Each structure stands twice: as C-alpha cells, then as structure tokens.
C-alpha cells in the first residue's frame, strides 16, 4: 500500500507466501525474501559496458581464444546480454491497454 510505486499494475497481488512452523536452531522466528525487480538492470548495464570496454581494444582476449573459442563468441554473449537489458526495460513503467484507440500526449514538452 505504501510501496505502490514499486509494483506492477498488470500483475495483481504480487506475493507468493510460504510459512513453516519450524524456525532455525536458536531462532524464534525469521523471514526470507525473493524479489524479481527491473531495478537489478544496473548489473547488466554495467557488465555489458565493462566487457565492451574490453572488446573495443580486444584486451585480455587471447587468454580466451587460447582455449579454442571464436572471436565471435564474446560478441554473441554480450548481445545475449543487451537483449536482457531490453527485457528489463520493456516491463519498466509498462502498461497493458487498447490499440489504435489512442496515442500519447503528456502535460508539457518544454523543459
């Protein structure tokens, strides 16, 4: 109710609960979260860049073609990672609404 700006409007009631009667050894009670948030997209935004920073100069790469992979393999693997940046970006701020009925105006254009 508080963190409404942190949930996704087209997935109602965002929780899977489970509850075991049995605590840890010595603990009264405890909790364990799992969350799947678009907010982890930073990792993939940085590592595809920290890797790009290497491929732009082909730095260290000869240790890796040194085991018989191809110079293509690492671009394939960054490009697999770029599409997963689009994957987090496409559910960011997302809506689910009617088609050909509308096209968007905001409230002002000028900064």
């Amino acid at each position: 109710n508080k963190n409404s700006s942190y949930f996704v409007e087209w997935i109602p009631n965002n929780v899977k609960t489970a509850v075991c009667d049995i605590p840890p050894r010595g603990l009264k009670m405890s909790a364990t979260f799992i969350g799947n948030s678009t907010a982890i997209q930073e990792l993939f935004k940085r590592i595809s860049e920290q890797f790009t920073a290497m491929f732009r100069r082909k730095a260290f790469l000869h240790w890796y073609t040194g085991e018989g992979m191809d110079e293509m393999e690492f671009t394939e693997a960054e490009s697999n990672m770029n599409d997963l940046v689009s994957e987090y970006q496409q559910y960011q701020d997302a809506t689910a609404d009617e088609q050909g009925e509308f096209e968007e105006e905001g409230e002002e254009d000028e900064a």
Partner: protein
C-alpha cells in the same frame, strides 16, 4: 704534401665509426587491435488488444 728533405711521417686517419645513416628507428608500428561498434536494441514485450 710539400715539406722537409728526406723521410716524412706515414700517417693514416680514416675514422672507423659509421656516419649519420638512414636509421630513424622511432616510428609507430603496432597499435592495439581496436574496433568501434555502434549498437542498437528494440523492446519486444507481448502487445495484444
């Protein structure tokens, strides 16, 4: 060369070391292998009506 009567001194003077020579030496040879890449992405979620 003209000079004193009788025996005169017998002097060679050809300097052994090489002169100035074509060895400039300091030229760029092997820059590290460096490709630029423009890159692109296109968001592709489910889009029904």
């Amino acid at each position: 060369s003209p000079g004193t009567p009788g025996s005169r001194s017998r002097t060679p003077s050809l300097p052994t070391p090489p002169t100035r020579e074509p060895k400039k030496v300091a030229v760029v040879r092997t820059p590290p292998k460096s490709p630029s890449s423009a890159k692109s992405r296109l968001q592709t979620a489910p889009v029904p009506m």
